[PDB]
Design a protein around this ligand. Structure first.
Ligand SMILES: NC(=[NH2+])NCCC[C@H](N)C(=O)O
Length: 241
């Protein structure tokens, strides 16, 4: 029993996030809110698992999954083959794509127009990878610890464009008409992406979360949550690809 409490209290599942990614997770009057926050609460409750959500940030979240200090993550995280080498994922719960966020005056009409330009991304994201895919890795791509800061460098002209997830870019534009930004989609260039909850490799929580996610989808709770954040019916068939 050394190092533990010999079972005196069942410990809570430690869930990490980077709450700087509206509408999925963000801070509002000192609380973490968003689509992921709601979906997590429904999932863990269906699983019967007491939990704590921590706003630990993006790069720390991955480091902490590796060490198993954090048991689980939800953070608008794309399921990728490279990530699967290090972590496990739940079944998918959302579909997304990368998009190009620019100022309304921008001449950018597609990804190839970014040649010779500076691109802001959040570090170690699928947006960074998509940016690197275009013309290769290099210092022309500026990497920030939050998507928030990437967008701030767009606003002040530090970068020419940001590559980030479509619902985040769309939500930012909707909430900030005064900033006169626009979203440029390039479906021939960018791939379909699916979000999953993330776990350390070999996690006992995965199977429980997959079952609870199905429970939440099947009961109609998923679509209530989706309607709350996105104002339209989900196409649930996107979750069976
Ligand atoms: N909460 C966040 N900062 N999420 C960033 C997610 C970006 C992208 N979906 C990825 O998995 O790389």
């Amino acid at each position: 029993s050394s190092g533990g409490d010999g079972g005196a209290t069942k410990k809570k599942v430690v869930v990490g996030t980077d709450a700087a990614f509206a509408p999925f997770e963000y801070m509002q009057k000192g609380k973490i809110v968003g689509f992921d926050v709601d979906l997590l609460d429904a999932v863990m409750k269906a699983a019967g698992l007491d939990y704590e959500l921590k706003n630990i940030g993006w790069d720390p979240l991955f480091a902490s999954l590796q060490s198993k200090e954090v048991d689980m993550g939800i953070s608008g995280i794309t399921i990728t083959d490279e990530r699967k080498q290090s972590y496990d994922f739940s079944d998918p719960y959302f579909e997304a794509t990368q998009v190009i966020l620019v100022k309304q005056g921008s001449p950018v009409k597609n990804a190839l127009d970014l040649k010779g330009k500076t691109i802001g991304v959040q570090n170690a994201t699928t947006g960074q990878e998509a940016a690197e895919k275009l013309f290769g890795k290099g210092p022309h791509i500026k990497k920030f610890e939050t998507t928030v800061v990437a967008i701030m460098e767009l606003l002040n002209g530090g970068v020419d464009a940001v590559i980030t997830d479509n619902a985040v870019a769309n939500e930012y534009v909707k909430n900030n008409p005064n900033k006169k930004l626009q979203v440029i989609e390039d479906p021939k260039n960018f791939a379909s992406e699916y979000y999953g909850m993330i776990f350390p490799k070999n996690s006992e929580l995965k199977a429980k979360v997959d079952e609870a996610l199905k429970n939440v989808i099947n009961s109609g709770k998923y679509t209530e949550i989706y309607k709350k954040w996105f104002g339209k019916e989900p196409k649930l068939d996107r979750l069976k690809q």
